[PDB]
Design an enzyme around this catalytic site. Structure first.
Site, short mmCIF file in Angstrom:
data_model
loop_
_atom_site.label_atom_id
_atom_site.label_comp_id
_atom_site.label_asym_id
_atom_site.label_seq_id
_atom_site.Cartn_x
_atom_site.Cartn_y
_atom_site.Cartn_z
N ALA A 61 -24.40 90.03 40.85
CA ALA A 61 -24.51 89.15 39.65
C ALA A 61 -25.91 89.20 39.03
O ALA A 61 -26.03 88.77 37.88
CB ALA A 61 -24.14 87.74 40.04
N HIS A 82 -14.32 92.52 43.49
CA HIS A 82 -13.86 91.11 43.36
C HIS A 82 -13.03 90.92 42.10
O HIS A 82 -12.70 89.76 41.78
CB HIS A 82 -15.06 90.15 43.46
CG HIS A 82 -15.82 90.33 44.73
ND1 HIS A 82 -17.15 89.99 44.87
CD2 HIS A 82 -15.43 90.86 45.92
CE1 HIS A 82 -17.54 90.25 46.10
NE2 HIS A 82 -16.51 90.82 46.76
N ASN A 102 -33.88 93.63 44.45
CA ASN A 102 -33.43 92.21 44.48
C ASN A 102 -34.67 91.32 44.43
O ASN A 102 -35.66 91.68 45.10
CB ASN A 102 -32.60 91.93 45.73
CG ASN A 102 -31.60 90.81 45.53
OD1 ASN A 102 -30.61 90.96 44.82
ND2 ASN A 102 -31.84 89.68 46.18
N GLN A 154 -34.80 88.27 45.61
CA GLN A 154 -34.73 87.48 46.86
C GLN A 154 -34.53 88.40 48.05
O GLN A 154 -34.10 89.54 47.89
CB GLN A 154 -33.56 86.50 46.83
CG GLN A 154 -33.78 85.30 45.92
CD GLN A 154 -32.61 84.35 45.97
OE1 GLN A 154 -31.51 84.70 46.40
NE2 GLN A 154 -32.85 83.12 45.55
N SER A 193 -27.18 89.99 46.82
CA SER A 193 -27.76 89.40 48.06
C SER A 193 -27.15 90.05 49.31
O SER A 193 -27.70 89.84 50.41
CB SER A 193 -27.57 87.91 48.08
OG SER A 193 -26.21 87.57 47.82
N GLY A 221 -29.44 93.78 42.30
CA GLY A 221 -29.15 92.36 42.01
C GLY A 221 -27.97 91.81 42.80
O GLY A 221 -27.25 90.96 42.24
N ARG A 236 -26.28 82.76 44.15
CA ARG A 236 -27.11 82.25 45.28
C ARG A 236 -28.61 82.23 44.93
O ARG A 236 -29.38 81.81 45.77
CB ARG A 236 -26.84 83.06 46.55
CG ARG A 236 -25.37 83.01 46.96
CD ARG A 236 -25.08 83.77 48.24
NE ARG A 236 -23.66 83.67 48.55
CZ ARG A 236 -22.68 84.32 47.92
NH1 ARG A 236 -22.96 85.16 46.93
NH2 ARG A 236 -21.42 84.15 48.29
N1 AR6 Z 1 -33.12 89.82 36.84
C1 AR6 Z 1 -32.90 90.03 38.14
N2 AR6 Z 1 -33.36 91.17 38.70
C2 AR6 Z 1 -33.13 91.39 40.00
N3 AR6 Z 1 -32.48 90.63 40.87
C3 AR6 Z 1 -32.03 89.51 40.29
C4 AR6 Z 1 -32.19 89.14 38.97
N4 AR6 Z 1 -31.58 87.91 38.75
C5 AR6 Z 1 -31.09 87.57 39.91
N5 AR6 Z 1 -31.33 88.50 40.89
C6 AR6 Z 1 -30.94 88.47 42.29
O1 AR6 Z 1 -29.58 88.82 42.38
C7 AR6 Z 1 -29.08 88.41 43.67
C8 AR6 Z 1 -27.61 88.09 43.52
O2 AR6 Z 1 -27.12 87.47 44.73
P1 AR6 Z 1 -25.78 86.60 44.61
O3 AR6 Z 1 -26.00 85.51 43.61
O4 AR6 Z 1 -25.28 86.26 45.97
O5 AR6 Z 1 -24.79 87.70 43.97
P2 AR6 Z 1 -23.67 88.68 44.56
O6 AR6 Z 1 -23.26 89.58 43.43
O7 AR6 Z 1 -24.17 89.31 45.82
O8 AR6 Z 1 -22.46 87.70 44.91
C9 AR6 Z 1 -21.46 88.22 45.83
C10 AR6 Z 1 -20.15 87.50 45.62
O9 AR6 Z 1 -20.26 86.14 46.09
C11 AR6 Z 1 -19.59 85.26 45.17
O10 AR6 Z 1 -18.82 84.34 45.86
C12 AR6 Z 1 -18.71 86.19 44.33
O11 AR6 Z 1 -17.49 86.47 44.97
C13 AR6 Z 1 -19.65 87.39 44.18
O12 AR6 Z 1 -19.07 88.62 43.76
C14 AR6 Z 1 -30.01 87.27 44.13
O13 AR6 Z 1 -30.71 87.66 45.30
C15 AR6 Z 1 -31.01 87.10 42.97
O14 AR6 Z 1 -32.34 86.86 43.40
O1 4NC Z 2 -17.81 81.40 36.05
N1 4NC Z 2 -17.68 82.50 36.57
O2 4NC Z 2 -16.59 83.03 36.78
C1 4NC Z 2 -18.89 83.21 36.98
C2 4NC Z 2 -20.00 82.49 37.39
C3 4NC Z 2 -21.13 83.18 37.78
C4 4NC Z 2 -21.15 84.57 37.75
O3 4NC Z 2 -22.27 85.22 38.16
C5 4NC Z 2 -20.02 85.28 37.34
O4 4NC Z 2 -20.04 86.65 37.31
C6 4NC Z 2 -18.88 84.60 36.95
#
Ligand code: AR6
Ligand code: 4NC
Ligand code: ZN
Length: 282
Positions: free
Chosen positions: A44, A124, A224, A226, A200, A198, A56
């Site tokens: 995301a 997803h 990332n 974080q 986690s 981007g 997150r």
């Molecule tokens: N501009 C940026 N540049 C780099 N990293 C970034 C930026 N903005 C945010 N981040 C980092 O982006 C990271 C995103 O971590 P998470 O939010 O867990 O995203 P996921 O895609 O792994 O979510 C997985 C699934 O969980 C859900 O339930 C759904 O099912 C999802 O598909 C963080 O560490 C931010 O610091």
């Molecule tokens: O509302 N949604 O479905 C969302 C919320 C956050 C997200 O990062 C996304 O890809 C979808």
């Protein structure tokens, strides 16, 4: 659902200083040139510069929910432009420097970016994509499919079927789509370079796929803001905005980040476009 584990949310951001950042992207540059088969895993964080909050991070959906606050969208899914990162991933595929792309995002932007669907696993699902239960025919729509959790949308199939059309958005209980996960796994195992952008890497088995690359001597790069579950297994972690990293990377690779002509759908990938000649590395 209520019970579902949403893993570690709201961890602090790390910011590599410019000198260390500039140098780490030159090393990423070197690893793209060295690698025969480069696979990108996205999450995301590549969509946050479009106004779509992550899950997150500091102001993530799950993060603001824990503190009793609401995530803030600066756009609708329909009016969201793909990022510089989204458009950089398009050029990298077109020039043959990207074998497969694996995303956990449902925001639909990869596809709307013009990215070839046959080189993409949407692990997803996709808010714009409904699928016929009967014949498994998908429909990339121009507005978000109004349901979630593989529920009937109300529309029927139109193949030369009248099959029930449902959303592609996995619920917490729902298993991943086997076709997407299988191609995503093959790509990940076969890869000599896996770059995460981007994400986690907290979800199974999505987050674990970059680690399949590391088996058989493949390199793993994590970009990332974080920490991430598998930071320990990385050969290179870059802590910065992915738009910055990918804009500097493309500039090292001699590549322009292409224009977005508005939402376009590319089912199949084309033969590779010309690309600059490789520097002398060793
Ligand atoms: N501009 C940026 N540049 C780099 N990293 C970034 C930026 N903005 C945010 N981040 C980092 O982006 C990271 C995103 O971590 P998470 O939010 O867990 O995203 P996921 O895609 O792994 O979510 C997985 C699934 O969980 C859900 O339930 C759904 O099912 C999802 O598909 C963080 O560490 C931010 O610091
Ligand atoms: O509302 N949604 O479905 C969302 C919320 C956050 C997200 O990062 C996304 O890809 C979808
Ligand atoms: Zn059908």
């Amino acid at each position: 659902p209520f019970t579902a584990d949403k893993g570690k949310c709201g961890l602090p951001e790390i910011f590599d200083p410019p000198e260390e950042l500039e140098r780490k992207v030159w090393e990423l540059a070197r690893l793209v040139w060295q690698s025969s088969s480069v696979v990108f895993h996205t999450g995301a964080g590549i969509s946050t510069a479009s106004g779509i909050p992550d899950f997150r991070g500091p102001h993530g959906v799950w993060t603001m929910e824990e503190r009793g606050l609401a995530p803030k969208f600066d756009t609708t899914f329909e009016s969201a432009r793909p990022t510089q990162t989204h458009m950089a991933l398009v050029q990298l595929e077109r020039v043959g420097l990207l074998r497969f792309l694996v995303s956990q995002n449902v925001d639909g932007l990869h596809v709307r970016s013009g990215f070839p669907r046959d080189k993409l696993a949407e692990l997803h699902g996709n808010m714009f994509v409904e699928e016929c239960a009967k014949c498994k025919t998908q429909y990339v729509r121009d507005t978000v499919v109004g349901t979630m959790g593989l529920k009937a949308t109300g529309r029927l199939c139109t193949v030369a079927c009248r099959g029930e059309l449902r959303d592609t958005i996995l619920d917490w209980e729902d298993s991943l789509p086997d076709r997407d996960l299988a191609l995503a796994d093959e790509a990940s195992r076969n890869a000599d370079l896996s770059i995460t952008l981007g994400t986690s890497l907290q979800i199974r088995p999505s987050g674990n796929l970059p680690l399949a690359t590391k088996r058989r001597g493949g390199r793993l790069v994590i970009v990332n803001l974080q920490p991430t579950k598998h930071d320990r297994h990385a050969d290179l972690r870059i802590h910065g905005y992915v738009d910055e990293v990918m804009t500097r990377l493309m500039k090292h690779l001699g590549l322009e980040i292409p224009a977005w002509d508005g939402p376009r759908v590319l089912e199949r990938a084309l033969p590779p476009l010309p690309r600059p000649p490789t520097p002398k590395l060793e």
